[PDB]
């Protein structure tokens, strides 16, 4: 597949508020959150990946093996736990987060020199796009 490794700076963040509200994030935390511009710092070696979502407020760190279900601790976001699997779908990464909220997960892929992220929960869609600083 491809190598997602890089420091990717946020360019686009669409519908983040609705996504966070669907996760029952409280108004105060939602308020500070949509002023953040979280970046993605990714390091990958084959199926082993660390995805760090970095913001000035709080970070969220994912560390996993593609194909292997793990207990995902979403402290800092909605403080839930999911039974999560990230899978290859050709050159895209497809993540299913099993738990309280239905249809929760995301897709990550590269189009040209842009990193694209679609986050989903309960039919709510948030679009994020990032680029490395050339
Ligand atoms: C609300 C909220 C945040 C949400 C982060 C999210 C929703 C990250 C999603 C990452 C995905 C979907 C894939 C790569 O791991 C962070 C923790 C930045 C700051 C505190 C407020
Ligand atoms: Na930020």
UniProtKB/Swiss-Prot annotation:
<keyword id="KW-0813">Transport</keyword>
<dbReference type="InterPro" id="IPR000566">
    <property type="entry name" value="Lipocln_cytosolic_FA-bd_dom"/>
</dbReference>
<dbReference type="GO" id="GO:0055088">
    <property type="term" value="P:lipid homeostasis"/>
</dbReference>
<feature type="binding site">
    <location>
        <position position="40"/>
    </location>
    <ligand>
        <name>all-trans-retinol</name>
    </ligand>
</feature>
<dbReference type="InterPro" id="IPR031259">
    <property type="entry name" value="ILBP"/>
</dbReference>
<dbReference type="InterPro" id="IPR000463">
    <property type="entry name" value="Fatty_acid-bd"/>
</dbReference>
<dbReference type="GO" id="GO:0002138">
    <property type="term" value="P:retinoic acid biosynthetic process"/>
</dbReference>
<dbReference type="GO" id="GO:0016918">
    <property type="term" value="F:retinal binding"/>
</dbReference>
<comment type="similarity">
    <text>Belongs to the calycin superfamily. Fatty-acid binding protein (FABP) family.</text>
</comment>
<feature type="region of interest" description="Important for interaction with STRA6">
    <location>
        <begin position="21"/>
        <end position="31"/>
    </location>
</feature>
<feature type="binding site">
    <location>
        <position position="62"/>
    </location>
    <ligand>
        <name>all-trans-retinol</name>
    </ligand>
</feature>
<comment type="function">
    <text>Cytoplasmic retinol-binding protein. Accepts retinol from the transport protein STRA6, and thereby contributes to retinol uptake, storage and retinoid homeostasis.</text>
</comment>
<comment type="subunit">
    <text>Interacts (only as retinol-free apoprotein) with STRA6.</text>
</comment>
<keyword id="KW-0963">Cytoplasm</keyword>
<dbReference type="GO" id="GO:1904768">
    <property type="term" value="F:all-trans-retinol binding"/>
</dbReference>
<dbReference type="GO" id="GO:0005634">
    <property type="term" value="C:nucleus"/>
</dbReference>
<keyword id="KW-0488">Methylation</keyword>
<dbReference type="InterPro" id="IPR031264">
    <property type="entry name" value="CRBP1"/>
</dbReference>
<dbReference type="GO" id="GO:0006776">
    <property type="term" value="P:vitamin A metabolic process"/>
</dbReference>
<dbReference type="Pfam" id="PF00061">
    <property type="entry name" value="Lipocalin"/>
</dbReference>
<dbReference type="InterPro" id="IPR012674">
    <property type="entry name" value="Calycin"/>
</dbReference>
<keyword id="KW-0683">Retinol-binding</keyword>
<dbReference type="GO" id="GO:0005654">
    <property type="term" value="C:nucleoplasm"/>
</dbReference>
<dbReference type="GO" id="GO:0005504">
    <property type="term" value="F:fatty acid binding"/>
</dbReference>
<dbReference type="GO" id="GO:0015908">
    <property type="term" value="P:fatty acid transport"/>
</dbReference>
<protein>
    <recommendedName>
        <fullName>Retinol-binding protein 1</fullName>
    </recommendedName>
</protein>
<feature type="binding site">
    <location>
        <position position="108"/>
    </location>
    <ligand>
        <name>all-trans-retinol</name>
    </ligand>
</feature>
<keyword id="KW-0551">Lipid droplet</keyword>
<dbReference type="GO" id="GO:0005501">
    <property type="term" value="F:retinoid binding"/>
</dbReference>
<dbReference type="GO" id="GO:0005829">
    <property type="term" value="C:cytosol"/>
</dbReference>
<keyword id="KW-0845">Vitamin A</keyword>
<dbReference type="GO" id="GO:0005811">
    <property type="term" value="C:lipid droplet"/>
</dbReference>
């Amino acid at each position: 597949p491809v190598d997602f490794t890089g420091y990717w700076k946020m360019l686009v963040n669409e519908n983040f508020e609705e996504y966070l509200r669907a996760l029952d994030v409280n108004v105060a935390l939602r308020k500070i959150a949509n002023l953040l511009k979280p970046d993605k710092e990714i390091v990958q070696d084959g199926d082993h990946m660390i995805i760090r979502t970095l913001s000035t407020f709080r970070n969220y760190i994912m560390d996993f093996q593609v194909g292997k279900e793990f207990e995902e601790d979403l402290t800092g976001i909605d403080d839930r736990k999911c039974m999560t699997t990230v899978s290859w779908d050709g050159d895209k990464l497809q993540c299913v987060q099993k738990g309280e909220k239905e249809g929760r997960g995301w897709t990550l892929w590269i189009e040209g020199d842009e990193l694209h992220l679609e986050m989903r929960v309960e039919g709510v869609v948030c679009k994020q796009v990032f680029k490395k600083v050339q």
